[PDB]
Amino acid sequence: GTHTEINLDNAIDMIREANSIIITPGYGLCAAKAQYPIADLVKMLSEQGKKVRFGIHPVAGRMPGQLNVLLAEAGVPYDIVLEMDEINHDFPDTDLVLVIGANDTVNSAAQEDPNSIIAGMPVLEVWKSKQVIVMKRSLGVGYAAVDNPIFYKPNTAMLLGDAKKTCDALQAKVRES
Numbered sequence: 001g002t003h004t005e006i007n008l009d010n011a012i013d014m015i016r017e018a019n020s021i022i023i024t025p026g027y028g029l030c031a032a033k034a035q036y037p038i039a040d041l042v043k044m045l046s047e048q049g050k051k052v053r054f055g056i057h058p059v060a061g062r063m064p065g066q067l068n069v070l071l072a073e074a075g076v077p078y079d080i081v082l083e084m085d086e087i088n089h090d091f092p093d094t095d096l097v098l099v100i101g102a103n104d105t106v107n108s109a110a111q112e113d114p115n116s117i118i119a120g121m122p123v124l125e126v127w128k129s130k131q132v133i134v135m136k137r138s139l140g141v142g143y144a145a146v147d148n149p150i151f152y153k154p155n156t157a158m159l160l161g162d163a164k165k166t167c168d169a170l171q172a173k174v175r176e177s
């Protein structure tokens with residue numbers, strides 16, 4: 001089949017091996033209320049000395065600034081939350097990107113296909129990192145109703161499930177130490 005599926009233990013080993021992690025959150029994160037386990041995951045991984053930051057697209061979510069507000073409300077410190085144009089240049093130097101409920105905001109067809117409906121629209125360049133894990137329930141579309149090439153790239157693994165079920169489980173496995 002055209003994409004790669006991984007399990008939770010594969011994801012934990014990828015996190016463990018990464019020094020630098022960027023989370024790119026989208027609508028799926030807050031649809032699932034996954035902000036709460038994620039804020040604890042990030043605190044634990046930061047305590048293990050990893051560089052853990054968020055890269056948030058200005059149009060992520062369904063309301064302006066929605067991911068920024070909900071992550072702040074959940075306790076994520078403002079100093080590790082960056083704007084797209086502040087963080088995009090770092091993706092080639094990033095060991096692991098966690099795409100959590102984002103799709104349109106990380107869709108490479110905006111740069112790779114000049115005849116795409118989203119051609120020319122700015123995106124987060126997550127496919128330039130060493131390893132991408134996409135957390136969503138299916139191989140299906142987001143708001144713009146288009147396919148996303150990053151799901152079939154060789155450095156992408158799909159971690160399929162509801163975002164809060166997955167992140168609760170990853171929080172538990174990291175808490176194991």
Ligand SMILES: NC(=O)c1ccc[n+]([C@@H]2O[C@H](COP(=O)([O-])OP(=O)(O)OC[C@H]3O[C@@H](n4cnc5c(N)ncnc54)[C@H](OP(=O)(O)O)[C@@H]3O)[C@@H](O)[C@H]2O)c1
Nearest residue numbers: 026027028061062063064102103104105137138142143163
């Ligand atoms: N921010 C705004 O104010 C605003 C306003 C108007 C339009 N928009 C548009 O909406 C989009 C925002 O980009 P985005 O990357 O945040 O999101 P998105 O590209 O619309 O994709 C969110 C996708 O999240 C997954 N998802 C939904 N519920 C989930 C759950 N419970 N667990 C796991 N995954 C879940 C769905 O895939 P599955 O069904 O496979 O899980 C979903 O594809 C852009 O096209 C933007 O232009 C934003």
